[model samples]
Target chain A: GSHMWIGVISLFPEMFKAITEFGVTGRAVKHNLLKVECWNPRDFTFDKHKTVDDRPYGGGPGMLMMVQPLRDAIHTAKAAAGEGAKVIYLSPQGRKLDQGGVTELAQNQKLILVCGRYEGIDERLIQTEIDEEWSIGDYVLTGGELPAMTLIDAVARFIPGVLGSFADGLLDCPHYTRPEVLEGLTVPPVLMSGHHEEIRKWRLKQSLQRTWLRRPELLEGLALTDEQRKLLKEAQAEHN
Target chain B: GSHMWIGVISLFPEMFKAITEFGVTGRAVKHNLLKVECWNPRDFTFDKHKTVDDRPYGGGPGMLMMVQPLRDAIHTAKAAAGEGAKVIYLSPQGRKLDQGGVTELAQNQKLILVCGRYEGIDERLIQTEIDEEWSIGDYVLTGGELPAMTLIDAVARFIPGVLGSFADGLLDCPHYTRPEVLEGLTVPPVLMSGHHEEIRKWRLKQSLQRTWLRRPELLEGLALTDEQRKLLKEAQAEHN
Candidate 1:
């Protein structure tokens, strides 16, 4: 069984608990398909107060994560992860994380994520030690913990059996059941026809139409088959 | 005491605990600057098993959250939030979230976020009830719990006093401390200088330069003052 190991450095290690114990990510962790370890920078500190941050060189609003503790933590994680481990810093200044990036990351056997808090990490530490930086989005967060979790979740989905039988990367179609008629809006008649081929075509068309309407950019990169092209045209005309 | 209330509909209500008790967000919660309540759709189910999801209408990979239970939960949340409450659905199909969006959402008195799981919520529910859709990034997650948390964290930062003295929206500058010479790299000389004007100019230059290099798009919308423009030119020249 293949397993992906992720080591996270954060002041708040408890933040990783929910993802490690809930939903699909939890199931992966339980099955040993994914392993996550949290390294608190405070643990690497020599001071009695276990300080991990200090005043910035330039006068600023918030404390900056000191270089020493974080650098030590990264060294520890890399030592444990062995060779070829990529050290990533989660920051707003990093390259934006996307599905393609997640897929690429899933191929790595080990990942070390540095989660920054306060203003950010010491720039020299990033320049000297970090291999790469990634941003979850254009917005900022209280810390990188959520972004790290988000990346882990996305990467876990690429592990075989994590999504069970539905790991094909297809956008889901509409669903209905039981009381088929709710608020006088009945489930679409095509779903109840019991015709397998018709149902398949209908679902593909809906996937195409939904993607086209909501996320047209997704369709641009997708290589649609002839049947899919026909269905998309039909969907476009119907919507118009 | 002004408080911004957020109503979240999630299956795993316990997931919100860490955020409510950790870091800056925890302090905001403690001070009553932010109040978050989770409404479980499971509580709205009438059946013995408390079912909330059903098979897809057109037959797809996973279960789709049923409309009835979620509708009931949204109704309960909206009732508690009173009038003008915006209901946002966290989905990849939504608008890409950025700092501007967070700032705008922070202005709202109340926000009800629908955190969908499984395949997704019934399309009819989104059509009839949701006011907006927001995506944290281009990647998909196991569920919307992380996205919801990310939104809360970002929105909370914009709240007055939530970030304390760091409420300014500018991206933070590099930081260093203590052993000024770490790995033979000394702290920038301008920082240790007693001249206040030089330090201010140096920090602004760093901020402008970092933004230009890492997130140049951010600088496009920002109207640079003459000093900032001159400093940016200097930064570009030095980097080149």
Candidate 2:
């Protein structure tokens, strides 16, 4: 019953197929719950060479994305994405994107993602046209296309019904299936008992245990319930 | 002149074409500076349907990646990757990956990245076959293929000679090219001046300024030189 639109501007538009032609995002599009399009800045260029980049003004090792084509491509995307759509540029200079940010991005009915290449789009384009900038992680990449697709995958999962039957477990715990013993490793006996409440508690405790061991920073902002606090404490005892 | 090897275990091995066939990564491969190969867990399956996933023991909404196929795939990747190649599982239940971690990972001559799908591979598979687990960012995705590719793209940038002519700039300042103005936004005059020292200081100041405005946390760990400190303070004065 609900639908969303995401327009992407990238030099390598072929890269977007990974999200739109397979996996969850693909199924979402196939189910008509989402609409995604790709526009290349090259297509917007008027030059005989169809130039999208040039030497930096200050003489850098890398080329800088020229403003004209990218600006035009973004304008084309914004026009089709309609009003209120945020023009997000994926860059290392942007705010770090988190799940909370993904959830907020998901709430938008329309989004226009600008994926810059080379040294990155001209600064003028960002100041004149961009609504926001986001980084996938604290690392450099060859280009923003992968980050853009990663953002799409992350944002699309939060879209209603796109994830199908899965309830979207943020940090999954250990899972077992079929023959209990596989190369001598058996499924935990607690899981085999099928005692619903115990099973649920075991699952919750394991995730809490995992979150603490793997990403302790994630727990800092969390308000764990009394039950969760108890479970996590008990999990630590088991660990030692 | 140095080289590295990375092996990826994924069901959607085709998704990696984005990196291996285009851009910097592709050029790296073409120049024989890097070696990357993808192995599908589905291909590792011996079952009639090439089954890779099944219902979880605890009965979750999503299917769990069965141990057998993935274990076999990992084993295959390991055999080819040789000893000391860290078997990294891309998952939320892992250490948050940062540029520091990417540099550490790049130091390894070989890497085996396991991209899990569905609900995730059996816990036994992780415990028994995996050497490490890593997340691209603090957000969920449809599957680990994107993260796997993202990791490859990030890590590849750190390898010697893979980045070609350009030295990586972690946080780039505003860059201008060709046309002095676009849609009424002009390149900062300092960038156009041939005074090398002034241009360098101006660029450094802008990055610090932008970092403070967009990602204040990035400045927390820095050991700023006296010149940098003065530039940053001047940037602050300009901003106010």
Candidate 3:
């Protein structure tokens, strides 16, 4: 099957049931369009306590997720994935994730994601077992699990039917539905006119207007069509 | 108890039990250190179908998350949070979430988070209901629930017992633990000498080294202590 496959190496595999059983990813799983497996590093440990963590070598305030268990877990996941599979460790040190990264990574037939605190992971494990490290953002989280879920949810959108989709690079324009009038506020008037061309231009201009207001950097270096240039010009004048 | 409180307005509320039952956030909930509530907008709809979404106003491939249900849900969440509560709508167009944003948001004792697809949200609802907008990253996702969870997990770090933390602005250094020798790789010998001050300096040098290696921009505009300057100098020499 050419379906999506994800193997996560984590301490809290049970947490993944949220995505596997409930949300958009859950729908993908139910349809058999996607498959997610959790490989707990703790299961690879041999001690009676099944110890998977220890005090940091350089002495830190947090426990370091040990090398052997995580390494073995990564080996198992990679083995299961066969060739072309990548081991991704979620950490703040890695390249920041963006839509481009999502589009690029979704091309992979399989992915093995490792979850952990930025400093909790043993450096040896990261160096030896990981292929790529991706950070959701600059913010810190309790562990890698949330970021892993975020990555999966975002990447799943590329899968067919996972999205029950972006055309422009700019922020999306406003949308409205039935009962357009609410508390004296109304849907944009242009959307109501029967002219398709004006509506298209209106939406594009709104995207440009919103993007310029919120994320002007996105508009930088982006090639724009002549029509888009005119619409942007109009949008700028209207914004002031 | 002055515990953390999170009110999430989402289409899929059941998905949140993952955080409520497992991980650091779970522990906080079990110990009464945190509280989480879910409000489904669908529940607010009164119809034969209880519809929470409809076709986009200007006609798009995807459905538009309607205004009324979400507005009412936000109203309920705000009423519950009472004073000092803010409605944060997670969207790609919003201000990006960084550690600084997390720290500032964590100061709010209560937060009502609205979760939905970026394009699905009605612009009028955003103008009328949302108090703040925060984006996890530039990536796209199926919806806002994952981002909301990510935010909660990160902000929970500020809550005592969310476990382990961070210091300097630099990327965290690699950490090691137990069985100094793992398949021929050994923990840095400096950590084993039992020289406390040396170990501290070693950690700082490693942090500086790692930050420079992975995200040199972080070092920009960050004032360095005299000791840090000396250590960075040594670290730079070692790298060369």
Candidate 4:
């Protein structure tokens, strides 16, 4: 299978074990579709405490990640990831990550993601080494580990065989199993029927309806086929 | 010393070990300020193979998480979390999560987060049980696990001692330490001068400037104090 290599720089390298060993990411690794390695800045530090952070130049409530160790870690990660690898720093101040951005990053052969902690990293390191800064959302977390994992999970789904056949770009329809009824609610009759054509139309209509009701913005960019538009119109009428 | 109980429902309960055993969340758990429990949907499945997913009703490329097991998992989580618990389902189609939302969620005594895998959970289950839907961003990940963790991390930071003294409203300022000079860049003289007021003003000014340059939208709703306005103006002049 084809490979997508990812290099992560973090003080808490052990945090990555979750992604590397569990869930879809684990499956991806098992299939040889993705490889991830963590580089710790602490390992690069020469001090007795293996210090990787410092007080801010202007003075701040929390420490900022030191430039030297982080820079060294990034260089090592870049070398390992090979040429043309993009270095991304996960930050609250960076460009917001979206599906389109995830798609773009997934196309890259390799990525080196820097996970900053405490306040943030020294500005000079960002200016010198980072190619892009990505923010998962407007929220701030204790560190960038979650955001890094979020990016990896999202991007990895785009890789061939990573998501298996689910990469066909549909939002997916409702599902039911086992019991025919629960809490006075029954699975829609169409789903239970063996009629394949009728079931296809119903699923498409539901997908369109759900997408319209919840994420109308997704519909804006989509070029709908005539049948899909008809389905969406029927869905709108039903919901309305 | 207080408690913030978080219940997560996932197919891969082992994935949560990162948060439970490491970093800030680990510290919070150790201090008894945060408690997290994972409820596996697979455990609730009745089938011999323990199926938690099925082909979409209308037919789709990917399987949809079945309604039965997921609903059962949610019920278990809600019961464990006790009364007044909010059940949040993480999805790309949900309301975008932000710092404001994180702050609001942090006030809650308990939260039950449902982490959907495959395509997504059945819509019927969501309609019946979920209190709110939260999205980390517009990106789609392999599952809701990372988003759930992101929410927990962001929300936990607002807990009294989770972030300690750094819980002040403002975004943090830059930081420096130890070395008097490194790579021809020196720590700003004000930090070393031992003049408390000057150092404070400088840090605030830098924070304002950094926010303005990176995430100006964060400043829109904030009412600037007289001193802050003055500092901002000075920062603007220096940057320009």
Per-model TM-score on C-alpha atoms: 0.91, 0.94, 0.95, 0.87
TM-score rank order: 3, 2, 1, 4
* Model 4 alpha-carbon drift over 4 Å, by segment: A165-180, A188-240, B165-173, B178-180, B225-240
Tens-digit per-residue lDDT, B35-79, candidate 3: 999999999999989988877776766787877888888899889
Model 1 iRMS (Å) reads 2.5
Taken over the whole model, the C-alpha lDDT of each candidate is 0.84, 0.83, 0.83, 0.81
Give the CA lDDT, 0 to 100, for residue A107 in model 3: 90
**lDDT of candidate 2 over A1-240, digit per residue (tens):** 658888999888888788888878889989988888999989999979999888898776889787778888888998888788988999988888988888888888888989888788888778878889899988889899999898888878777898761123336778888778977889898888879899899998988887778667767777888988999999999999
Q: Pick by TM-score: which candidate is best?
A: 3
Candidate 2: segments with Cα more than 4 A from true spot: A165-170, A238-240, B165-170
Best by lDDT: 1
Kindly report which residue stretches of model 3 are placed more than 4 angstroms away from their true locations once superposed.
Answer: A165-167, B164-166
Query: lDDT per residue, candidate 2, B1-240, as tens digits?
Result: 668899999888888888888888989988888888988888978879888888988676888887777877888888998778888999877788888888889888899998988888888877788888898887878799999998888888887888651123327788888688787778788878888888888888887887778766667767777987898899899889
* DockQ of predicted model 1: 0.56
By TM-score, how accurate is candidate 4?
0.87
Error of 1 at B44 (Å): 2.7
CAPRI tier for the interface of model 2:
medium
| Predicted candidate 1 versus true structure: per-residue lDDT over A34-131, tens digit per residue | 99999998899998988888887756567888778888988998899999889999988788888888888888988999999988887778888899
DockQ of each candidate, alpha-carbon based: 0.56, 0.67, 0.75, 0.50
Error of 3 at A232 (Å): 2.0
Error of 1 at B45 (Å): 2.8
Put down candidate 1 lDDT per residue, B1-240, tens digits, no spaces. Answer: 446899999988888876898999999999999999999999999999999887776565678787789889999999999998899999877787988889889889899999999877877777778999888888788799999999999999888888761123345567776678877788899988867899888888888888887778778877788998999999999999
Which candidate would rank higher by lDDT, 3 or 4? 3
Using alpha carbons, what is the TM-score of model 2? 0.94
